Amino acid sequence: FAVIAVQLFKGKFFYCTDSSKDTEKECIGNYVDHEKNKMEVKGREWKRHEFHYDNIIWALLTLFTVSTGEGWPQVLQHSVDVTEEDRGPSRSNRME
Amino acid sequence: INRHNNFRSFFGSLMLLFRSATGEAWQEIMLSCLGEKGCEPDTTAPSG
Amino acid sequence: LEAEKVQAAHQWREDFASNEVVYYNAKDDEPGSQRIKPVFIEDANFGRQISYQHAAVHIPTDIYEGSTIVLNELNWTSALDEVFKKNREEDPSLLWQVFGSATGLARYYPASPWVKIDLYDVRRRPWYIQGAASPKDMLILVDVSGSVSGLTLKLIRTSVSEMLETLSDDDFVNVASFNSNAQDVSCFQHLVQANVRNKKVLKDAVNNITAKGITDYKKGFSFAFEQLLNYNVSRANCNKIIMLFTDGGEERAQEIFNKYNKDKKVRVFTFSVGQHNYDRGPIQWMACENKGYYYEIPSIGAIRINTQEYLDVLGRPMVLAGDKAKQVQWTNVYLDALELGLVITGTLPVFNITGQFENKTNLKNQLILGVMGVDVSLEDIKRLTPRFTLCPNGYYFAIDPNGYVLLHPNLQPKPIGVGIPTINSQEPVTLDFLDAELENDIKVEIRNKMIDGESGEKTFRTLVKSQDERYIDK
Amino acid sequence: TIIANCIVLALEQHLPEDDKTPMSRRLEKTEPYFIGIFCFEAGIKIVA
Amino acid sequence: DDGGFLLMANHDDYTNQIGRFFGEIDPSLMRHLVNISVYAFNKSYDYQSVCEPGAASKQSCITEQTQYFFDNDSKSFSGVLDCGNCSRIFHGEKLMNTNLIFIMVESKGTCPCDTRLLIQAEQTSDGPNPCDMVKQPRYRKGPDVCFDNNVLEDYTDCGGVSG
Amino acid sequence: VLRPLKLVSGIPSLQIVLKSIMKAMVPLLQIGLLLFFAILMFAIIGLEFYSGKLHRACFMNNSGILEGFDPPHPCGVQGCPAGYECKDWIGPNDGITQFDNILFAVLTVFQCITMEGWTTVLYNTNDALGATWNWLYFIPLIIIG
Amino acid sequence: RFNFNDGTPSANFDTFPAAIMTVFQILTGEDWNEVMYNGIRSQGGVSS
Ligand SMILES: *[C@@H]1O[C@H](CO)[C@@H](O[C@@H]2O[C@H](CO)[C@@H](O[C@@H]3O[C@H](CO)[C@@H](O[C@@H]4O[C@H](CO)[C@@H](O)[C@H](O)[C@H]4NC(C)=O)[C@H](O)[C@H]3NC(C)=O)[C@H](O)[C@H]2NC(C)=O)[C@H](O)[C@H]1NC(C)=O
Ligand SMILES: *[C@@H]1O[C@H](CO)[C@@H](O[C@@H]2O[C@H](CO)[C@@H](O)[C@H](O)[C@H]2NC(C)=O)[C@H](O)[C@H]1NC(C)=O
Ligand SMILES: *[C@@H]1O[C@H](CO)[C@@H](O[C@@H]2O[C@H](CO)[C@@H](O)[C@H](O)[C@H]2NC(C)=O)[C@H](O)[C@H]1NC(C)=O
Ligand SMILES: *[C@@H]1O[C@H](CO)[C@@H](O[C@@H]2O[C@H](CO)[C@@H](O)[C@H](O)[C@H]2NC(C)=O)[C@H](O)[C@H]1NC(C)=O
Ligand SMILES: CC(C)CCC[C@@H](C)[C@H]1CC[C@H]2[C@@H]3CC=C4C[C@@H](O)CC[C@]4(C)[C@H]3CC[C@]12C
Ligand SMILES: [Ca+2]
Ligand SMILES: [Ca+2]
């Protein structure tokens, strides 16, 4: 299952701190954050989801955490938002 | 790893372990105690 | 003329490792660029410390300096610093000269440091907007069906409110909503002049809408096209555009478009607002089947940049007009961003004319490079009208073709108030002649003779107000 | 017939504040047929 | 004076409030004076005026103004003021070569009435209503230069295919 | 929504399978009783100690009579640690997770015995009444319940 | 009914796949209380 899970979400668990940017080239600089009804200037970071499937060890750890039953809805949401090899997530893109 | 959940004391660590045993956010704790986190200021043992 | 020629001879480098771009960045104390430390000698005619040695550059927060787009713009614009000086030596009493790029950066001379958070964008300024396109007859369509309730509705309210900030006194606007029945949102029922007072009525009305019902694009667009064929009221007789603020549907509404705008004389700009998975196909089709554009607004951060970009589409017929569409325009009196008081700005667009010698590219040449502007303070105008050779009761005043006073004793360096301030200056100082002093039957006739333009004299008896707002005398 | 009714129920989409997808309006038209079929099968077992 | 501001008094209680609008202290006589066409007002709006924020720093808002002046060139005025189950007779003469008026009325205690105050000051407002201003708008002349619907336009780039 | 359940009556094999499922679950009923009493036992204990003790929180931040930590810090018998002041608070989960009456207490206890967010309830009463005796109520509740 | 002012949660009952995913998540008993909170505040809050 971990080997199959790698081929499904390998490299696709990346995201920029602001939803506007989709790749790492654009995800650089500063942006205005409009969370909690308050503006703030924050740097743009091309981050990765905490639990991913980049290789087989990370896939095994993610599947173990899912099997324990902890945080698996968030991993499911991240997997559903998966779009492409090196692009930021799109909401409910691949619900299958 | 905050004022509610930390390994600072024996009973705090025991409570953290019980919380993980019931499976609350044990992966979040694992991530929060992973890497190059800032260290508690040591009041004693002066250094340069 | 220099900006058009210099930009045409640009090679579009892709790397700036060796030949770094050297410039002075305002609001400062990254690879591919080199900074400049200026001297900043004090000088009159300005309220701050300036420098005639070079020109400062302002790059908005949301735009990263050091990318390929900005760095290329920062190279061919470095040839404007010589022309900036040549204008100043030829006219020592010259205020800010600024080139607002379509990229988003503004390069102004002389160099002064920039003035919480900074939300300045040169493309949203009234002097940029008036030169980027011609007046319009915008009519905003808002989808208030049930599916837009929640986050989408509060995004549509902010998107419409931020869209009214791009309209001026020469533009005419109305907001209409539809959910199985199309109706006006406010007390207007036709296109209004979109001044400061009228834009607040639409803002309050659009902030009080609720979402319920079923979408009906045929009835929503029939109401929109009927509103743009009124001709019973004062209009702009210019760009007629329909702004559809929706989320997503499945109706192409074909039969309406081949009925009303068979010749495609009305543009349709469609916006998809919110986080959803509805089909955007019909929204994308009617957008560019009617010479328009399609925009997406998924979050608050995308509201500001997407409600300003429709002026690129409206600027296409202005670019194709060539040298005929290059006339200097002057804005309404407004407060300068760099704290200089009340100013008016000249305006001339810049066209991107690479390869026009052989006439072969014609692909990105229908967009403007930006807008050139020069500031004129009202104190400069007041110096040309001396007032000490006549009694205190005598004075000068100048009037806009819209009736506003460019110069008047009753004009003050404060924003004009609208409504009552209820709590839990980007608007211009547009004060009418009939509001600057006491209105009269003769005043209306006299003002109307100044709007169209014709000399004359008239002596009469009028009751005038005193300096302290306590007495009136004839 | 029951399988078809299950599929029809599975294709419904719910929208807030009395809103209907155009597909859901078409699906709303199939209910009388199912109701009539079930009424027939109930009548065949009540009185026969 | 020309504006109804208290410049003289008799009770020695009005003299403390010298230089005050007469309508703020004697609304009954002041309102009748406007009615008999000795003082004539027009109001006006001040759009560049700072106002104290209300319940939903300082912000600008429209404050309606009002000013009073002599209407008719008649000099002497006499009449009877009616306020309800009471009668007060007044005589008014205007000082020559001056913007002053002299009035004499019976004391306010004689008539047990108290009408609402007629205040002449900076009162915050929101008028005029723009809902009916647009029906008969002021004359204006817009630009005669229009640029739209050029046959050479591309418009081959939507917002969807590019994205 | 019971229309899919007509497939069970259509196929008697599914009827047999469902009958077996139900038959295997009958002896659990007494266990369920032993569960309910436990839920009844602790809820009452939570009603006599935690009733109305989770209605204040640290809010004062001289920023608009609002704000505070994203996991809001309920007030108690000691006060806020810093330039915050105790103010009326709707409740932890918008007023849902509390021991106001027996129904709210029963719901909170049932949520706790499922080990879903019971630590949040424990920490809410830790800074509202002190952390001395609260552990004596929740640790047995997980162990027994 | 799950589109609030801050956005609709991923665990909603709008479409059949989303409803079945939410029901499966509740069956596994992980973060079911957070779904219950949304389901309560959608019917009129803690009051009704
Ligand atoms: C005035 O008009 C002229 C032409 O009318 C215009 O000059 C043109 O500028 C563009 C740059 O925006 C050049 O584009 C070339 O072609 C593609 C553009 O897409 C680039 O290749 C990659 O394309 C992908 C996506 O298409 C993109 O993400 C990526 O960044 C691109 N680059 C890569 C992968 O390295 C080419 O690289 C790019 N050429 C070069 C040298 O980079 C056109 O070639 C230009 N045309 C002419 C005739 O010069 C000019 O920009 C207009 N003025 C202004 C101010 O914009
Ligand atoms: C774009 O940048 C390049 C590099 O800075 C400029 O090219 C140089 O111009 C200087 C001055 O004429 C020459 O001496 C160099 O030989 C040029 N090439 C280099 C440095 O590699 C170019 O002028 C800039 N474009 C514009 C329009 O100013
Ligand atoms: C105002 O516009 C409307 C259409 O938007 C037109 O109304 C006309 O009203 C007059 C008198 O009732 C009649 O001629 C017709 O009933 C209407 N149509 C036309 C074509 O005249 C008209 O254009 C304007 N109304 C006027 C001028 O009274
Ligand atoms: C200012 O006061 C004048 C005179 O008191 C008023 O003008 C009115 O309209 C015409 C124009 O002069 C006069 O014939 C009337 O007698 C005036 N009074 C009334 C009641 O109509 C008016 O109050 C003010 N003028 C304005 C606002 O233009
Ligand atoms: C009953 C429990 C065990 C779950 C059984 C799995 C079935 C019933 C569920 C789980 C995942 C679901 C799928 C999730 C997402 C999609 C993509 C969407 O565009 C069409 C429906 C489709 C394809 C769903 C159909 C129903 C589905 C296949
Ligand atoms: Ca859990
Ligand atoms: Ca809809």
From Swiss-Prot, chain B:
<protein>
    <recommendedName>
        <fullName>Voltage-dependent R-type calcium channel subunit alpha-1E</fullName>
    </recommendedName>
</protein>
<feature type="topological domain" description="Extracellular">
    <location>
        <begin position="1"/>
        <end position="48"/>
    </location>
</feature>
<comment type="subunit">
    <text>Interacts with EFHC1. Voltage-dependent calcium channels are multisubunit complexes, consisting of alpha-1, alpha-2, beta and delta subunits in a 1:1:1:1 ratio. The channel activity is directed by the pore-forming and voltage-sensitive alpha-1 subunit. In many cases, this subunit is sufficient to generate voltage-sensitive calcium channel activity. The auxiliary subunits beta and alpha-2/delta linked by a disulfide bridge regulate the channel activity.</text>
</comment>
<comment type="similarity">
    <text>Belongs to the calcium channel alpha-1 subunit (TC 1.A.1.11) family. CACNA1E subfamily.</text>
</comment>
<comment type="function">
    <text>Voltage-sensitive calcium channels (VSCC) mediate the entry of calcium ions into excitable cells. They are also involved in a variety of calcium-dependent processes, including muscle contraction, hormone or neurotransmitter release, gene expression, cell motility, cell division and cell death. The isoform alpha-1E gives rise to R-type calcium currents. R-type calcium channels belong to the 'high-voltage activated' (HVA) group and are blocked by nickel. They are however insensitive to dihydropyridines (DHP).</text>
</comment>
<feature type="site" description="Calcium ion selectivity and permeability">
    <location>
        <position position="24"/>
    </location>
</feature>
Swiss-Prot record, chain C:
<feature type="glycosylation site" description="N-linked (GlcNAc...) asparagine">
    <location>
        <position position="359"/>
    </location>
</feature>
<feature type="domain" description="Cache">
    <location>
        <begin position="330"/>
        <end position="428"/>
    </location>
</feature>
<feature type="binding site">
    <location>
        <position position="147"/>
    </location>
    <ligand>
        <name>a divalent metal cation</name>
    </ligand>
</feature>
<comment type="subunit">
    <text>Dimer formed of alpha-2-1 and delta-1 chains; disulfide-linked. Voltage-dependent calcium channels are multisubunit complexes, consisting of alpha-1 (CACNA1), alpha-2 (CACNA2D), beta (CACNB) and delta (CACNA2D) subunits in a 1:1:1:1 ratio.</text>
</comment>
<feature type="binding site">
    <location>
        <position position="143"/>
    </location>
    <ligand>
        <name>a divalent metal cation</name>
    </ligand>
</feature>
<feature type="domain" description="VWFA">
    <location>
        <begin position="137"/>
        <end position="314"/>
    </location>
</feature>
<comment type="function">
    <text>The alpha-2/delta subunit of voltage-dependent calcium channels regulates calcium current density and activation/inactivation kinetics of the calcium channel. Plays an important role in excitation-contraction coupling.</text>
</comment>
<protein>
    <recommendedName>
        <fullName>Voltage-dependent calcium channel subunit alpha-2/delta-1</fullName>
    </recommendedName>
</protein>
<feature type="glycosylation site" description="N-linked (GlcNAc...) asparagine">
    <location>
        <position position="352"/>
    </location>
</feature>
<feature type="glycosylation site" description="N-linked (GlcNAc...) asparagine">
    <location>
        <position position="232"/>
    </location>
</feature>
<feature type="glycosylation site" description="N-linked (GlcNAc...) asparagine">
    <location>
        <position position="75"/>
    </location>
</feature>
<feature type="modified residue" description="Phosphoserine">
    <location>
        <position position="18"/>
    </location>
</feature>
Swiss-Prot record, chain D:
<protein>
    <recommendedName>
        <fullName>Voltage-dependent R-type calcium channel subunit alpha-1E</fullName>
    </recommendedName>
</protein>
<comment type="function">
    <text>Voltage-sensitive calcium channels (VSCC) mediate the entry of calcium ions into excitable cells. They are also involved in a variety of calcium-dependent processes, including muscle contraction, hormone or neurotransmitter release, gene expression, cell motility, cell division and cell death. The isoform alpha-1E gives rise to R-type calcium currents. R-type calcium channels belong to the 'high-voltage activated' (HVA) group and are blocked by nickel. They are however insensitive to dihydropyridines (DHP).</text>
</comment>
<comment type="similarity">
    <text>Belongs to the calcium channel alpha-1 subunit (TC 1.A.1.11) family. CACNA1E subfamily.</text>
</comment>
<feature type="topological domain" description="Extracellular">
    <location>
        <begin position="12"/>
        <end position="30"/>
    </location>
</feature>
<comment type="subunit">
    <text>Interacts with EFHC1. Voltage-dependent calcium channels are multisubunit complexes, consisting of alpha-1, alpha-2, beta and delta subunits in a 1:1:1:1 ratio. The channel activity is directed by the pore-forming and voltage-sensitive alpha-1 subunit. In many cases, this subunit is sufficient to generate voltage-sensitive calcium channel activity. The auxiliary subunits beta and alpha-2/delta linked by a disulfide bridge regulate the channel activity.</text>
</comment>
<feature type="transmembrane region" description="Helical; Name=S2 of repeat I">
    <location>
        <begin position="31"/>
        <end position="48"/>
    </location>
</feature>
Curated annotation (Swiss-Prot), chain E:
<comment type="similarity">
    <text>Belongs to the calcium channel subunit alpha-2/delta family.</text>
</comment>
<protein>
    <recommendedName>
        <fullName>Voltage-dependent calcium channel subunit alpha-2/delta-1</fullName>
    </recommendedName>
</protein>
<comment type="function">
    <text>The alpha-2/delta subunit of voltage-dependent calcium channels regulates calcium current density and activation/inactivation kinetics of the calcium channel. Plays an important role in excitation-contraction coupling.</text>
</comment>
<feature type="glycosylation site" description="N-linked (GlcNAc...) asparagine">
    <location>
        <position position="42"/>
    </location>
</feature>
<feature type="glycosylation site" description="N-linked (GlcNAc...) asparagine">
    <location>
        <position position="35"/>
    </location>
</feature>
<feature type="glycosylation site" description="N-linked (GlcNAc...) asparagine">
    <location>
        <position position="85"/>
    </location>
</feature>
<comment type="subunit">
    <text>Dimer formed of alpha-2-1 and delta-1 chains; disulfide-linked. Voltage-dependent calcium channels are multisubunit complexes, consisting of alpha-1 (CACNA1), alpha-2 (CACNA2D), beta (CACNB) and delta (CACNA2D) subunits in a 1:1:1:1 ratio.</text>
</comment>
<feature type="glycosylation site" description="N-linked (GlcNAc...) asparagine">
    <location>
        <position position="72"/>
    </location>
</feature>
